[PDB]
A = this chain, B = another copy of it.
Amino acid sequence: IQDFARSELFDRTFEEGMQLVEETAAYLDGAGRHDSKVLSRNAALGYATESMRLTTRLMQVASWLLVQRAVREGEMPPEAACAEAYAVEELPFGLMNLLQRSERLYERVRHLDRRMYVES
């Protein structure tokens, strides 16, 4: 019943989660700023709302990975986490990439979340 028996994979998807967050904050406060301020207004409004979706999505993943790590270290009980979460767009190259990486990271976590807690 216990299992969670975390390693190898988790351990891999944790590294993906943390690197994505580091590259996002570096982009949004760096190149993304200059990428967005040379857009048209409709493209910038699109950049604005899609930046929010990116950071929110990563917040869920970061929160998930850190809690599951806290459970793996024994800081949090294995039983706590059993309720715990789970239009025209021509955007810049950098934002578009991080958004596609975050989507692949999200469902990678969601599938891991279901096999880890929803099963069977």
What chain B residues lie within 8 Å of A92 (beta carbons)?
Answer: none
What chain B residues lie within 8 Å of A69 (beta carbons)?
Answer: 66
Asked if residues A80 and B25 are in contact (CB atoms below 8 Å), the reply is: yes
Each complex incorporates copies of this chain amounting to 2
Residue A105, interface by CB 8 Å: no
Residue A94, interface by CB 8 Å: no
Name the interface residues of A19-39: CB closer than 8 Å to any CB of B: 21-22, 24-26, 28-29
Q: Label chain A's interface by main secondary structure.
A: helix
- How many chain A residues have a CB neighbour from B under 8 Å? 29
Would A63 and B67 be within 8 Å (CB), given that A22-B77, A77-B22, A80-B25 are in contact? Answer: yes
12 A-B pairs with CB atoms under 8 Å apart are A18-B76, A21-B76, A25-B79, A26-B77, A28-B79, A52-B83, A59-B80, A59-B83, A62-B76, A63-B85, A66-B67, A66-B69
